[PDB]
């Protein structure tokens, strides 16, 4: 009951089948550049890889899940902390666009306000959960 | 120059291999119903397309022990120089001789339509 | 459809009928009816405008 | 394939050989901690996909009504009252083949008499 | 005519049981796929063959 | 009272319905012949 | 068929085989890469005598090891000395082949190559099957016989 | 059709309410390779944490839209080949009686 706030989210997976390059990438709403999902973990809280999939995997023993996140930490390897991963977006001026972006235009369903940092990257790993899952076809 | 130096060279590795092989063949014909000389007779009986006739003319002979049902049943029927040449396909395993024809059975009646 | 059972390619399942028009039809043999009938009505708007394109 | 990550900052662990040994050794680049290959594998492909056959298989997989209840006699239990799906492996190549998950045990049985599937 | 009625309801139920035949042939993966084929597509191709065959 | 249930679409790829309280209900232990041929209560 | 032989069933049977396009993608059920310091000495256990025989009668730490279906293989009817010199022939001399025979049940043809190679063999395995043609003209796929 | 009639939605809160006093385990402190099994649990689509006994709660849930309490169109699924519970409250949802 307020607008209908119609701020659409992609979750892309880059790389066809030859193309090994399985970088998961992801259209910010305002930062027009498909932002590969580690720079998003990171812009969050979640900077250390296997802690960024966990969040995916919610096991850990599917080696045909983790082989696919496999360059994608790669992809993001050289950005780590918060400082940074809020950085490559559109510093003093980006360190803002990006963190009321992320509260605002990324997943604005569960919270728009702030402290739901957990609550939406723990969401957009179970958006690229089901997003290998059809490429492994289970 | 070097031509023959590796054509012997072969010719007399492939007698090294019948010479361990025509003794596998014979204590198997014997633990259950010279040979080094029988083999440098028949590794010059075949002496690029020479190693990969060599190297199947190596795992289809040296076919043992299941695989020595029929390789044994060829040092007991095969004729010399008159089965030498031959490359067969079934020249496998007595079970590898019948499942290449089970999917061989379906080979043609897929492809008839 | 939830009338069925998870796994079902059963000849009824997969929409066929077995009953004419005259001893009537069940209410699936009717619904797999209404699907593939309505096919045969949508097909019609679409290539008797692009043959009008065709025709042209 | 089986990969761990850094036993300090959690972090993707990187092939690097100690050609000296010549020994495999899986390292964090992130900083400096190595560990050595327990598995001298470094990747595996599988083209031919044979883990997807028994995909959502809970003990309470005879709690959806919707899945028909079978007939047939488990090998190790015996039970007439078992539960059945189709391949959960969403492959279209993929032959309509049957999984029986008991009620009494949930010992997985194939309906198979070609491909036997004992995992 | 009385008993043709009855004799259709036959030749629908006889096609019903080379319905199972494909069924139980392709539950235990013997079912001998075709050219070209999918094995899921090589039972539904044949299927319908048989329940068309007995429609006509 | 639990007499009957409102089912959205989505809520209904988990249940199983009947046709009829009667036609699709007991069990077996003559036969119409002009009726329609409809399928079983087997579930 | 050509002029003469219009119903003989068995030419068809050949040009068949001689015109689908067969790929390394068909052929192959998993390709996996080790770590074998040693050109000779292979650590695989199911590969530990395959070696020894096309061995006897400078090269690469990476291995490429990939196994083989037997039916998939025996459908466009092959030999592992088919692929070994169709592969062979493919990278020619900056790439080196041995495999298992068909007499060998593990189905395998293992690979290796002449400061970095971990990421390098892990480019070559994406050519390798969709690239590589292995019998048949390409794009022309599901050959079917009609009398 | 004439039996069907379309949702005006209700609301989220008194489930969510629910769902917590049952077992509705923390999506900002959930370990995801901990509780594997943990049946994830959604309202409207958007998720708010996971469960460990789903047939459980899922049970108890039916009874209050069969006595009145959980709006009567709202609609809740489990899935079992997932293990997932999408509770909808959404507003236009089609609903037919049986
Ligand atoms: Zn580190
Ligand atoms: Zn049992």
Known sequence: KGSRFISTLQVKLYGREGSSARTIKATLPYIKQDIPIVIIFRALGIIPDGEILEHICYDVNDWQMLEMLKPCVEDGFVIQDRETALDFIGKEKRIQYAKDILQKEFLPHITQLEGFESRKAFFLGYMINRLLLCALDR | DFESEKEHKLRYNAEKMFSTLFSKFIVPETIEAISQEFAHNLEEELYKIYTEKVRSLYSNLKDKKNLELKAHVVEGKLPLNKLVNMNASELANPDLQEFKEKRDKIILENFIV | LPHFSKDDYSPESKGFVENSYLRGLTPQEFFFHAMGGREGLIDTAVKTAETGYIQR | TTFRFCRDCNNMLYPREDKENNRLLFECRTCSYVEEAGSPLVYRHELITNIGETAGVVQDIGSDPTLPRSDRECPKCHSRENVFFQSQQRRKDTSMVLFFVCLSCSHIFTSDQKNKRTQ | DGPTMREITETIAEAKKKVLDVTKEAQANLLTAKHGMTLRESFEDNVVRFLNEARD | EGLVEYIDAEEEESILIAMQPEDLEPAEADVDPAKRIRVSHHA | ?147 | SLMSCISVGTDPMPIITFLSEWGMEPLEDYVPHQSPDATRVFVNGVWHGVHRNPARLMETLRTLRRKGDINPEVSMIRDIREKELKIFTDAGRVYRPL
């Open chain 7, 1 to 147: 068929l050509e002029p003469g032989h219009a119903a003989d069933q068995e030419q068809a049977k050949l040009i068949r085989s001689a015109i689908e396009h067969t790929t390394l993608k068909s052929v192959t059920i998993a390709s996996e890469i080790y770590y074998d310091p040693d050109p000779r000495s292979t650590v695989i256990p199911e590969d530990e005598e395959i070696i020894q025989l096309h061995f006897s009668l400078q090269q690469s730490p990476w291995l490429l090891r990939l196994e083989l279906d037997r039916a998939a293989m025996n459908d466009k009817d092959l030999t592992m000395g088919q692929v070994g010199e169709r592969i062979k022939q493919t990278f020619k001399n900056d790439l080196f082949v041995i495999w298992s025979e068909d007499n060998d049940e593990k189905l395998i043809i293992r690979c290796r190559v002449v400061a970095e190679e971990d990421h390098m063999l892990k480019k070559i395995e994406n050519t390798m099957l969709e690239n590589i043609t292995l019998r048949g003209v390409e794009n022309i796929e599901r050959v079917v016989m009609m009398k």
